Amino acid sequence: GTKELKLKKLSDNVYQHISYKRVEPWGLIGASGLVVINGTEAHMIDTPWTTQGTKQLIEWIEAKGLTIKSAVVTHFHEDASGDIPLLNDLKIKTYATSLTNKLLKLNQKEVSSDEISSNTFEFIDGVASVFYPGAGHTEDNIVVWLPNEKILFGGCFVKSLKNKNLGYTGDANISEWPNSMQKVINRYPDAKLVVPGHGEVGDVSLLKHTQALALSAAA
């Protein structure tokens, strides 16, 4: 890959995009989203962390001859929603919940072109569903389920196993996070792969691990 963007194949139709940003004292650290390929159409789950990441990702997808039909952003932070303005200009439909758009507007950022106004939403017909579990990392965080591959994109709602803490909790609801996570655990007993917003992909233990971190941060 490059200094800004790496692509990892997760299945025949599913890629992990890993975009890099210098965050001292760590150096270049990564944020994860997905590209979901549905015939000649591609869909973005989260934008890369930097505009240069997003431009390189749009180039990689288009170089396969695919049309980027749409993007869904999984929360209002820059590592999920950062390049809404670039996608809106390129006329790539952006989907965000009413809560995500409220927090983008509160923070003087451009809202999505298209608003999710239900707790569950068919993002790609038969391929990608959005679920709002309640507050955790942020008030607005959503997860995306890929039923064909048994892949759950948890985003920054889910921590990697190695994480000893919840990360940036400035926008978090630590008391609600465990109950929100129980709804995700209860909903996807069939999840084969869980993709956190940062860190290594894993199994459902990442859900239980995040719930435990939240229960401990509360106590």
Q: Which residues bind Zn ion (CB under 5 A)?
A: 77, 79, 156, 197
> 79 or 149: whose CB is closer to Zn ion?
79
> 82 or 127: whose CB is closer to Zn ion?
82
Q: Is 137 annotated as a binding residue?
A: yes
Q: Is 198 annotated as a binding residue?
A: yes
Q: Is 17 annotated as a binding residue?
A: no
User: Least distance from C-beta 91 to Zn ion, angstroms?
Assistant: 27
User: Least distance from C-beta 46 to Zn ion, angstroms?
Assistant: 9
Instruction: Reduce the secondary structure of the chain to three states and give it as a string.
Output: CCCCEEEEEEECCEEEEEEEEECCCCCEEEEEEEEEEECCEEEEECCCCCHHHHHHHHHHHHCCCCEEEEEECCCCCHHHHCCHHHHHHCCCEEEEEHHHHHHHHHCCCCCCCEEECCCEEEEECCCEEEECCCCCCCCCCCEEEECCCCEEEEECCCCCCCCCCCCCCCCCCCCCHHHHHHHHHHHCCCCCEEEECCCCCECCHHHHHHHHHHHHHHC
> 79 or 139: whose CB is closer to Zn ion?
79
> 43 or 77: whose CB is closer to Zn ion?
77
Q: Which residue is nearest to Zn ion (CB)?
A: 77
User: Least distance from C-beta 198 to Zn ion, angstroms?
Assistant: 6
User: Least distance from C-beta 171 to Zn ion, angstroms?
Assistant: 7
User: Least distance from C-beta 88 to Zn ion, angstroms?
Assistant: 21
CA distance readout (Å), 36 to 107, 110, 131, 163, 180: 29, 24, 17, 27, 25
Q: Is 77 annotated as a binding residue?
A: yes
> 178 or 196: whose CB is closer to Zn ion?
196
Binding region: 75, 77, 79, 137, 156, 198
Binding region for Zn(2+): 75, 77, 79, 137, 156, 198
